[PDB]
């Protein structure tokens, strides 16, 4: 008892010194002397949980809660362990018991709030975060997590004061050398300085270094030339998103397009096979595919990467779900670069480069990144739309009365043959137009009746609202649709006689200044509506309230549900103009809208995430859509909505340039990506440390 107290004290001491295994040995020795030692079981479980030994940590948590039935702190930390083991229901039970044992336990309410948050139940998360902050007013983790909840649903109550407090919390935590309560991925949404955002990321990169230093592994011996690889550069793509995820929707064609004479492609998957065609394609077209989800140990997984002789390891996650940045902290490869998946800096010294471009990351804001800049010639952004949605390369319209290109739209691999079977088809100078006749009335009747599909002249004509009933793999983008699809403004309640401004982003990317900008545009263009998504639905009443306070009636804003991927991209053809979010642009979402032929107005900022859209537009060749300030953004948007001849010109420009520009040309992108790889390698092979590659 007294001796066990001393042993638990020494283990706590050795724990603070970093000697984790000596702490474990001494915790076990305290349990050997006094088995019914709740604090020792709880201390040992916390140490095992930090080592990643979650099942073993669970054993000692269960002992602690039995010995001390009022040990609320143990229930809470046990729930934290179950959450990490992906037992969400079990974690909810532990948090619930912790709050029942001690209703004033602030940490337990906050942990319960995070379960509601991860589960999608934002109003319940907000309620539990506010209880935590009512119990403990000085609670950075709960305050910052509540702030992000309010961001998701566009609750901007006391927004300016909230932003000021978030900055103050980060400044204090960085000053007191603690891990910031703001997640590095969220830092783009808050008016933090570039220095603070880099420092937040740097603190997270140091966590990975701390986790790998306990492995006590030496530095790897890296290859010095390409002899052992037969002159080929070995590139390893590491991602948790080889499957149904934006990442594969952008780059699934790139591994199979690499030149095998000069490159050997290794894809390192951090997630298990989700059964989709996205995973099938990357597994089939990469030279090598390694499922690291079967190798939980970061030491053994890093050994595997080094064994393959990787020259350039590519971090496609950053600080996003499923990341294992410990792999990069171990440095199994001599060159390690950030690419595509994470729109921000890692802040970590083990990442050498960030692959970007001059429009996204001009040399002036290079102090925002810890990595050296590595420029792609046009944009670093890419998308697989030409392969996934070839049925949207061309379109035809039905004249339901001048002539509109975005009221009733047909798309399909076999559209031309269907058109050739119809009489009186007109070609506008080239867009085919079907006149209002028996064929056209049958299409509208299908839409109004909610019918799934019809047949005209033997051709399958599908309702664009019903793709999951016709071919679910086509609806998700895993297969190219094999019918002709109808898309109409009446399917979404859009006005037939007005300008449609759209934004299909998650609502969290909007802030008060952005919605005020949009309200100013709608007031100047009386014949117009704003088209947004329930993303999530609980954000809709907040947007509508703020719009009503700004003087916009309810009928000026139209909401649609989130749609399957193919319908999402296809319905963008119904808008006239996309109004991009300046706080954080459309990234995947901007490629989606441009593939539909929709002009996008953007106002680039300073952070990477606020400049992606302008870079896409610069590559597309539409400099006139990039605004230097909020007033120019409004002026551009209003001109597109009122100068109807200008609108037709710009829409024709976007429609053509999405094919003729580099933006969607994955083969060209891969070859420029390969040119940049060899610049990195030849720079390293000559014995130099990483430097900016900006020419």
């Amino acid at each position: 008892p007294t001796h066990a107290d001393s042993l638990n004290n020494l283990a706590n001491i050795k724990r603070e010194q970093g000697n984790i295994e000596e702490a474990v040995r001494l915790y076990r020795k305290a349990l050997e002397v006094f088995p019914e030692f709740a604090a020792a079981h709880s201390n040992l479980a916390s140490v095992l949980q930090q080592q990643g030994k979650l099942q073993e940590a669970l054993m000692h948590y269960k002992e602690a809660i039995r010995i001390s039935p009022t040990f609320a702190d143990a229930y809470s930390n046990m729930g934290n362990t179950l959450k990490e083991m992906q037992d969400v229901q079990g974690a909810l039970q532990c948090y619930t018991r912790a709050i029942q044992i001690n209703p004033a336990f602030a940490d337990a309410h906050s942990n319960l709030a995070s379960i509601h948050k991860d589960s999608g139940n934002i109003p319940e998360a907000i309620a539990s975060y506010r209880t935590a902050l009512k119990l403990k007013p000085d609670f950075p983790d709960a305050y910052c997590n509540l702030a992000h909840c309010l961001q998701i649903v566009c609750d901007w109550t006391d927004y300016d004061e909230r932003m000021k407090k978030l900055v103050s919390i980060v400044a204090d935590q960085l000053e007191k050398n603690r891990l910031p309560s703001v997640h590095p991925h969220h830092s783009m949404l808050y008016p933090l300085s570039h220095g603070f955002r880099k420092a937040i990321a740097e603190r997270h990169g140091n966590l990975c270094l701390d986790k790998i230093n306990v492995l006590h592994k030496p530095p790897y011996e890296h290859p010095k030339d390409l002899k052992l690889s037969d002159g080929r550069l070995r590139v390893g793509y590491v991602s948790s998103n080889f499957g149904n995820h934006p990442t594969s929707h952008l780059m699934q064609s790139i591994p199979g397009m690499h030149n095998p004479d000069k490159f050997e492609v290794f894809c390192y998957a951090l997630s298990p096979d989700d059964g989709t065609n996205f995973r099938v394609k990357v597994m089939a077209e990469a030279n090598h595919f390694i499922d690291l989800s079967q190798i939980p140990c970061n030491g053994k997984a890093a050994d595997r990467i080094h064994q393959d002789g990787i020259h350039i390891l590519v971090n496609m996650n950053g600080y996003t779900k499923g990341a294992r940045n410990e792999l990069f902290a171990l440095r199994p490869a001599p060159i390690q670069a950030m690419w595509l998946g994470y729109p921000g800096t890692s802040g970590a010294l083990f990442m050498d480069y960030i692959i970007t471009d001059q429009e996204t990351s001009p040399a002036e804001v290079a102090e925002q990144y810890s990595e050296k800049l590595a420029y792609m010639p046009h944009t670093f952004f890419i998308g697989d739309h030409a392969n996934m949605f070839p049925h949207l390369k061309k379109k035809a319209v039905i004249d339901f009365k001048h002539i509109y290109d975005n009221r009733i739209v047909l798309n399909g691999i076999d559209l031309k043959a269907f058109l050739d079977s119809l009489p009186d088809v007109k070609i506008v100078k080239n867009m085919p137009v079907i006149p209002m006749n028996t064929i056209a009335e049958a299409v509208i009747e299908m839409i109004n009746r909610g019918q799934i599909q019809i047949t005209i002249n033997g051709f399958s004509i599908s309702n664009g609202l019903a793709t999951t009933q016709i071919n679910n793999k086509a609806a998700t983008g895993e297969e190219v649709p094999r019918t002709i699809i109808v898309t109409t403004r009446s399917q979404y309640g859009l006005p037939e006689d007005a300008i449609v401004y759209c934004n299909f982003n998650q609502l969290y990317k909007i802030d008060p200044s952005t919605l005020q900008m949009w309200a100013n545009i709608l007031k100047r263009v009386p014949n117009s509506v704003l088209w947004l998504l329930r993303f999530p639905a609980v954000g809709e009443p907040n947007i509508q309230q703020y719009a009503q306070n700004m003087g916009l009636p309810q009928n000026r804003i139209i909401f649609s549900p989130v749609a399957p991927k193919e319908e999402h991209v296809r319905r963008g053809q119904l808008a006239d103009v996309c109004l991009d979010t300046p706080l954080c642009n459309g990234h995947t979402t901007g490629m989606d809208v441009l593939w539909a032929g929709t002009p996008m107005v953007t106002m680039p900022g300073e952070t990477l995430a606020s400049r992606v859209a302008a870079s896409q537009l610069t590559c597309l060749g539409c400099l006139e859509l990039i605004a230097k300030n909020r007033q120019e953004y409004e002026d551009i948007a209003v001109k597109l909505g009122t100068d109807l001849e200008y609108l037709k010109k710009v829409r024709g420009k976007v429609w053509k340039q999405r094919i003729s520009s580099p933006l969607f040309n994955t083969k060209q992108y891969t070859m420029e990506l390969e040119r940049l790889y060899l610049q990195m390698w030849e720079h390293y092979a000559a014995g130099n440390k990483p430097d900016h590659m900006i020419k």
């Binding site: 891990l179 991925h185 969220h186 997270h204 934006p246 600080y319 996003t320 998700t476 989130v562």
Partner: peptide, 14 residues
Amino acid sequence: YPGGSTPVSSANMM
């Protein structure tokens, strides 16, 4: 989407 799933870019746990 309602009735299925729409994966997005999201932060990792900390």
